[PDB]
Ligand binder design. Structure first.
Ligand SMILES: [Ca+2]
Lengths: 356, 76
């Protein structure tokens, strides 16, 4: 096809992995940093960073579907764990934390935090007693509440609005014992690359089952977030552009993952379903994945966005900067070619841990 | 000590825990307040998913730390 882009082989249940890989591969500034990670002395049967440079090199060069076989091997996984279905965001948090740890000490140290990390504040104020506490958290994604919210904007408001630590959840004022209080959360900084996880699930204890929320939830192509910052910056507005839509289809037990992307930051979108890559409309990538869509040939009821990726307008030429072979070290290139030549001559854990 | 857990709704609940508590204890203590089994719950603290077997102190969880509770949308 005239997509130029290539997909990934699915080893059994590895679509969650494939969908993530594309999302990260097209986070260009990140892909460069992976290329410059010292791995000459690493053991390929055990090196996760190596297997990533490998998948990224073939996704960039190969015109045939890339295998993710060696990547699971570097997780310390056996063949069966490649047949286990997992939450795509759970992978995101485990993999990126693993990799940020490996980049520590190298020249690309802390590249992951520079792209994905921001900060927020948690103000507590006792209702009856003069007592004000403050705490601050870092985040690499935001969990947006979905049930009952038209769109991203409303979901942010509920996130930042003022909650009530009443009755059975009073705040420990140490001296003043337990106290009714009011908690509120303001955002301090928003990262260059924004990861949103749409809380599309709940759990009922009376019935004891967890349900998928297939309700409608609207996300814009442009996401002005300045309102939710505590202090704004005029030279850098918190304006974001939609980059990736991670889509889970199915409800409850089953599942299948796909990712939609406009890698170059333009308007042209493509649908990466495992090895198949096809071009597609904006509507196919955005409106179709809003959810609550009534089971038609153009869109199924239980198919909807689960993760969204936004890139700051400001820092977007930087993040989506072009990746040539000029940015690929020669020492890497050789090692993968020699791997090709030697190849020519010839309870199950349900919790997604990486062991290397 | 008293930490914060942010449920699926988004509502913030409070948990009484010592820093020596294993994550399993914390998950089990969410089960008593929320009814969610420890199997199905994932805890996230500043981008690191919490790991059964470690303790709250190992992740530097202190008073007023907010843990984010999420589930699993499995997939293929
Ligand atoms: Ca529509």
């Amino acid at each position: 096809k005239h997509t130029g882009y290539v997909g990934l082989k699915n080893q059994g249940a590895t679509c969650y992995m494939n969908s993530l890989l594309q999302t990260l591969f097209f986070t260009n500034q990140l892909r460069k940093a992976v290329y410059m990670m010292p791995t000459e002395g690493d053991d390929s049967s055990k090196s996760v960073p190596l297997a990533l440079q490998r998948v990224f090199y073939e996704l960039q060069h190969s015109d045939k579907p890339v295998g993710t076989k060696k990547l699971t091997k570097s997780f310390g996984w056996e063949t069966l764990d490649s047949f286990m279905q997992h939450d795509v965001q759970e992978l995101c948090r485990v993999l990126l934390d693993n990799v940020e740890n490996k980049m520590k000490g190298t020249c690309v140290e802390g590249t992951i935090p520079k792209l994905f990390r921001g900060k927020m504040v948690s103000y507590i104020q006792c209702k009856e007693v003069d007592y004000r506490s403050d705490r601050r958290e870092d985040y690499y994604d935001i969990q947006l509440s979905i049930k009952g919210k038209k769109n991203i904007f409303e979901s942010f408001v509920d996130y930042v609005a003022v909650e009530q630590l009443d009755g059975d959840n009073k705040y420990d004022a140490g001296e003043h014992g337990l106290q009714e209080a009011e908690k509120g959360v303001k955002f301090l900084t928003l990262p260059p690359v924004l990861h949103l996880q749409l809380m599309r699930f709940m759990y009922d204890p009376q019935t004891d089952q967890n349900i998928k929320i297939n309700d409608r939830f609207e996300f814009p192509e442009q996401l002005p977030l300045d309102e939710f910052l505590q202090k704004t910056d005029p030279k850098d507005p918190a304006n974001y552009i939609l980059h990736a839509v991670l889509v889970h289809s199915g409800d409850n037990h089953g599942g299948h993952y796909v990712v939609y992307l406009n890698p170059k930051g333009d308007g042209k979108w493509c649908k990466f379903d495992d090895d198949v890559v096809s071009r597609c409309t904006k509507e196919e990538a955005i409106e179709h994945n809003y959810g609550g869509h009534d089971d038609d040939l153009s869109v199924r009821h239980c198919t909807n966005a689960y993760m969204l990726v936004y890139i700051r307008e400001s820092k977007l030429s930087e993040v989506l900067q072009a990746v040539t072979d000029h940015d690929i070290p020669q020492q890497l290139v050789e090692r993968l070619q020699e791997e090709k030549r030697i190849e020519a001559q010839k309870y199950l854990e349900k919790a997604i841990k990486i062991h290397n | 000590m008293q930490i914060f857990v942010k449920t699926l709704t988004g509502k913030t609940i409070t948990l009484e825990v010592e820093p020596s508590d294993t994550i399993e204890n914390v998950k089990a203590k969410i089960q008593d307040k929320e009814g969610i089994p420890p199997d199905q719950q994932r805890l996230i603290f500043a981008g690191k998913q919490l790991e059964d077997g470690r303790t709250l102190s190992d992740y530097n969880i202190q008073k007023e730390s907010t843990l984010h509770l999420v589930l699993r949308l499995r997939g293929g």
